[PDB]
Design a protein around this ligand. Structure first.
Ligand SMILES: Cc1cn([C@H]2C[C@H](O)[C@@H](COP(=O)(O)NP(=O)(O)OP(=O)(O)O)O2)c(=O)[nH]c1=O
Ligand SMILES: [Mg+2]
Ligand SMILES: [Mg+2]
Length: 430
DNA sequence: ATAATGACGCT
DNA sequence: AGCGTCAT
């Protein structure tokens, strides 16, 4: 009983920017603020693919992956901003630079793990200990958690949203043990007070709003973070897991959203995270392998161990472009030209990277897709990266792939190429 | 005819 | 090393 390791040793947060690219455009262009807007890339085919949607536009049914002309059918006052284009391709530099803004602020409170362009995990265990010594042993106010939700509360014996939020918050605080510094519920509560402050600083200093989740691990933090977007944070406690998971679709836990989670549903014949507790670990390892079974056995009990790695900077810098339909690259003049375009954006980013973060890449990864191939990558070969020069890299990339050209003649390329990819990896201090 | 990325796992 | 999974 006492000998069951309950996974409450750490405080972990996930901070995720709300409709990030839309917010980045709305700061630049006031005209777009507090209106239905989407961010699109490439206007030509159907008015553009949408990649980010404001919450106002979401309310009409606009989703990412949508064509902008379909979007205008559900939402005719939709406003659009389009991604920058350079050298024939979408260029995400604005949002990368806006991301650095936000990660840098986050870094002041705690070590962060950049998880994507718009979210980072936080390990607040140490900071919580400090704020807990500072706090003598005094109660925690609800004024210190003005945007926090407590998952599972309220329960027991106001019908409008903000009032409901405070009721759960006061229920949570009315049952706190504020004299016990190793009480994991107190620890979470304190973590969420820091995340209120970290989130105020972000919006104070950037104009960007975010949501967040505060729990004991990365899966729960991520999952908590999406229960009350936008502009809100959510505390998932160890004790709230069994109710939460009893109706939680398996596909919603991170890394179960694909073929693994579909096979858990299909082999086990279940639907919800909580039905995994029935199985023994050995059982789950026979169905799903040694690491997954172990991982699943703890995860359904709300235990996960993957640590917040100290890594604020990407490990790979890549540029890619699809050539869909009858835009597939069929001449070798054509393949060279786009390999050079890509290599010029890669060169400029690598030079900025070196001056920014004092490191040089040593390996260039080339990848193409051919037309009619059913995989998303047909080939991927490495080669040495010794100079940050676009023509050398694109020359090197071409020779690494030139023998994929099966066309009978010299100047053609067959079958036509549907994707090109250049990535810099293997960084070393400079 | 989503598209542009970026991390991590398997052999 | 090259490929595959899952994510955002
Ligand atoms: C999911 C996803 C997002 N993005 C770009 C713009 C998104 O704003 C940036 C951050 O992703 P996110 O947090 O999953 N989506 P969001 O920030 O727009 O919306 P939310 O407020 O977090 O729900 O993702 C893509 O470019 N491809 C994607 O598949
Ligand atoms: Mg976001
Ligand atoms: Mg995100």
């Amino acid at each position: 009983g006492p000998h069951m390791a309950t996974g409450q040793d750490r405080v972990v947060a996930l901070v995720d920017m709300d409709c990030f690219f839309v917010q980045v455009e709305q700061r630049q262009n006031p005209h777009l603020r507090n209106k239905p807007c989407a961010v699109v890339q490439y206007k030509s085919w159907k008015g553009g693919g949408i990649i980010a949607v404001s919450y106002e536009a979401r309310a009409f049914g606009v989703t990412r992956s949508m064509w902008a002309d379909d979007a205008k059918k559900l939402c005719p006052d939709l406003l659009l901003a389009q991604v920058r284009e350079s050298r024939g391709k979408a260029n995400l530099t604005k949002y990368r630079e806006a991301s650095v803004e936000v990660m840098e602020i986050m870094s002041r409170f705690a070590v962060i793990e950049r998880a994507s362009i718009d979210e980072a995990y936080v390990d607040l265990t140490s900071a919580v200990q400090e704020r807990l010594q500072k706090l003598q042993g005094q109660p925690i106010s609800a004024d210190l958690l003005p945007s926090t939700y407590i998952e599972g509360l309220p329960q027991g014996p106001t019908v409008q949203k903000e009032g409901m939020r405070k009721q759960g918050l006061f229920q949570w605080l009315d049952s706190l043990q504020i004299d016990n510094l190793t009480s994991p519920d107190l620890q979470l509560t304190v973590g969420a007070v820091i995340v209120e402050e970290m989130r105020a600083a972000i919006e104070r200093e950037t104009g960007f709003q975010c949501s967040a989740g505060i729990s004991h691990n990365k899966v729960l933090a991520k999952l908590a973070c999406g229960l009350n977007k936008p502009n809100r944070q959510t505390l998932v406690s160890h004790g709230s897991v069994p109710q939460l998971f009893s109706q939680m679709p398996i596909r919603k836990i991170r890394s179960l959203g694909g073929k693994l989670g579909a096979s858990v549903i299909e082999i086990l014949g279940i639907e919800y995270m909580g039905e995994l507790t029935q199985f023994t670990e050995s059982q789950l390892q026979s169905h799903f392998g040694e690491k997954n079974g172990s991982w699943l056995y703890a995860m359904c009990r709300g235990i996960e161990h993957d640590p917040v790695k100290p890594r604020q900077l990407p490990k790979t810098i890549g540029c890619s472009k699809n050539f869909p339909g009858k835009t597939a690259l069929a001449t070798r003049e054509q393949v060279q030209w786009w390999l050079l375009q890509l290599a010029q954006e890669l060169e400029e980013r690598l030079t900025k990277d070196r001056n920014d973060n004092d490191r040089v890449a040593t390996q260039l990864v080339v990848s193409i897709r051919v037309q009619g191939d059913k995989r998303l990558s047909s080939l991927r070969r490495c080669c040495a990266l010794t100079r940050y020069d676009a023509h050398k890299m694109s020359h090197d990339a071409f020779t690494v792939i030139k023998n994929c050209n099966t066309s009978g003649i010299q100047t053609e390329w067959s079958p036509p190429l549907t994707m090109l990819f250049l990535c810099a990896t293997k960084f070393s201090a400079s």
